[PDB]
Amino acid sequence: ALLQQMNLASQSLNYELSFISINKQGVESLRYRHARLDNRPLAQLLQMDGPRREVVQRGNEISYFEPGLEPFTLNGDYIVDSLPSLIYTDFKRLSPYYDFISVGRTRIADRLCEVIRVVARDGTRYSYIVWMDTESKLPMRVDLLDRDGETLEQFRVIAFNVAKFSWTPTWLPQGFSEVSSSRRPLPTMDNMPIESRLYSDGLFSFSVNVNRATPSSTDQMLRTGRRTVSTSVRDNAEITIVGELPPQTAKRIAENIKFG
Amino acid sequence: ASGALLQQMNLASQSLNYELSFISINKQGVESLRYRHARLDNRPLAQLLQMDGPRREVVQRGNEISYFEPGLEPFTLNGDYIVDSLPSLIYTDFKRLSPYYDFISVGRTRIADRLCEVIRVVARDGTRYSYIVWMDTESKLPMRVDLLDRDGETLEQFRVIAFNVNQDISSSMQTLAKANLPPLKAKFSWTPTWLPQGFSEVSSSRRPLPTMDNMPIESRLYSDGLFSFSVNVNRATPSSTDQMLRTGRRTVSTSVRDNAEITIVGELPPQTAKRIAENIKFGA
Ligand SMILES: CCCCCCCCO[C@@H]1O[C@H](CO)[C@@H](O)[C@H](O)[C@H]1O
């Protein structure tokens, strides 16, 4: 129980990582750089194979660039899928309904690391097994694992260096806070409105989306890596859960969302 | 001419006062519904009532569509008509389709003890679903409509069971004709290089997905006047993969290329959707 260091070291330190990302659709070669001048962070993610796609951070100004396209910027707090989002976790408020297991130390990229496991108390969310570096405290490898124990997504380092709805979910994994809500129109001929409620437990996030049921709305269950799209049809509504949640759970959140 | 009948069906559904008790059939099951319609002051009046289970009701008064249901707050939205009530085919400007579709008469038959003109609506390029229409010879109102996939299998059926055309406006349409009715550009870096003949861009919109990083997704709604589908493009995620799911008139095609997750949603044969996706260019 001391990832907080890895957390601070990743944000408050200068470095470079020539890591790879492995999932069910390939293994890609990347690279991430960090820094912090006047307390403002600096990042940079690059694709070493094929198109020189790039992404950079600056305070809250992430910008995208790549061959043959017009650049642009978005407002964010840190580049996602550039480094395990486990990095920015606010553990002090997470620990209450969480628990961190110590699990020996090993070698990740010719370095001595300290393996640590993260888990939800109730066992509703996914799981993480991180390999922190002894020296720097910078993560060398983080694995997302499903309840079973398989790796949904692997972050491996290769070289170090320095508004108002009519519905309400009556059941949440204890730890998630309704980060927001919104009601935008679907891109249909009838501008069908869909209401959304974004959640998060400090680590994982998922959305609950609702639209009037239609004659083609059917219960579906699709999971790819850390993306789980669960649809359920009942009470004249089409409920879609999207996020880092095992099916069993998503399906449960959509079954306790009562209307009045 | 067939095209003229389809044209007539269109007007009768908008001008006459009538009540249709019908069913909606698909994989999901059979739905019992009643549709009441009336024209008052050159203004649409209608109610769609789910006859079974909870009393769900929808109503049209001009360009307002109010949704009533027990145990929930009534509300209103804008709309030119109630979706999934009468077959949307009825509101089609067939003149616009004539150069792309064949309106083939298939003869006559009975439906709900009434004589009907049987017409087949088919897109000549073979890229789309087709329809079959059973029209009530006397009133021109639709008695049955079948959405068929390219192989001829029924994806959805509308069928009238009980029918009535009224010279006067019923008491319920009147009660509706004035009541406590509840309150209520973009430019993308991509372009679908290939589209079946007849489809045109109806709208476009960039909005943030309900994620933690407010990931942007761009949408383009297309229509040829009868069928519709949208092309949505968001930043490719490491969790993005090719998929194809069809359920009735809804096809959800997802492709992944050039760092973009492409999702086609709408009334299209899986093959047309894939082709549209595979032909989207970026810049240059
Ligand atoms: C980016 C994701 C967009 C999803 C848009 C879903 C739009 C569903 O739209 C609905 O589809 C039904 C068939 O499924 C039709 O029967 C309904 O009439 C139509 O309004």
Structure characterization notes:
The structure is a homodimer. With 260 residues, chain A is mainly β. Chain A has 2 domains: 1-162, outer membrane lipoprotein receptor (LolB), chain A; 163-260, Phosphorylase Kinase, domain 1 (2-Layer Sandwich). Chain A is 7% helix and 46% strand. Chain A contains 3 helices and 21 strands. Chain A has helices at residues 4-11, 91-94, 247-253; strands spanning 15-17, 20-23, 26-29, 32-36, 41-46, 54-58, 61-65, 72-75, 98-107, 112-120, 127-133, 139-145, 151-156, 168-169, 182-185, 193-200, 205-212, 220-224, 227-234, 237-243, 257-258. In chain A, the strands form 4 sheets. In chain A, strands 3-2-13-12-11-10-9 form a 7-stranded antiparallel sheet, with no helix packed on it. In chain A, a hairpin with a 4-residue loop joins strand 16 and strand 17 (205-212). The longest helix of chain A is centred in the N-terminal third of the chain and has 8 residues, at 4-11. Chain A is globular. The interface between A and B is large, with 52 and 53 residues. Octyl beta-D-glucopyranoside (BOG) sits between chains A (186-188, 190, 192, 214-216) and B (83-84, 232, 248-250, 263, 265). Octyl beta-D-glucopyranoside sits between chains A (186-188, 190, 192, 214-216) and B (83-84, 232, 248-250, 263, 265). Chain A: Belongs to the RseB family. Chain A: It comes from Escherichia coli (strain K12). Chain A: It is found in: Periplasm. Chain A: InterPro entries: MucB/RseB_C, MucB/RseB_C_sf, MucB/RseB_N, MucB_RseB. Chain A: Homodimer. Interacts with RseA with 1:1 stoichiometry. Binding to LPS stabilizes a homotetramer that does not bind RseA. It is classed as signaling protein.
